[PDB]
Structure 1
Amino acid sequence: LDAKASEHAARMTAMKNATDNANELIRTLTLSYNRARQAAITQEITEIVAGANAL
């Protein structure tokens, strides 16, 4: 009985840690995604404007 209680406590704590790590990873990846998005938009519009004022 003691061993089973310990097993479920260990699962609870470890799985809590896993979920928290997943949330932090998602937050950092979202920041990277936003930076990439802004960079892509800027580069696209810059190239279009250069090709437009080329004439």
Structure 2
Amino acid sequence: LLDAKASEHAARMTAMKNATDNANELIRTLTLSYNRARQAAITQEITEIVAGANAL
């Protein structure tokens, strides 16, 4: 029983570490898309403002 408890704790620790690594990778892959979308939004907004100004 004692050996089983020790093994359970070690396995949970390893699983949590792997989960943290996967979460960090997902975070960076999402930040790339966030930057792309931010650039696209800024471009669209400035284009709309300039077009509205030129319309007059």
The TM-score, its normalising length taken from structure 2, stands at: 0.89
- Structure 1 distance, partners of 2:11, 2:37, is 39
Moved over 2 A (4+): none
Deviations 1:4-28 (A, max 9, x none): 1110110111000111111111111
Deviation at 1:52, TM superposition (A): 1.0
Deviation at 1:30, TM superposition (A): 0.9
Q: What is the number of equivalent residue pairs in this alignment?
A: 55
Deviation at 1:32, TM superposition (A): 1.0
Partner of 2:6: 5
Q: 1:31 is paired with a residue of what secondary structure?
A: helix
- Structure 1 distance, partners of 2:6, 2:12, is 10
- Structure 2 distance, partners of 1:36, 1:10, is 39
Identity of aligned residues (%): 100
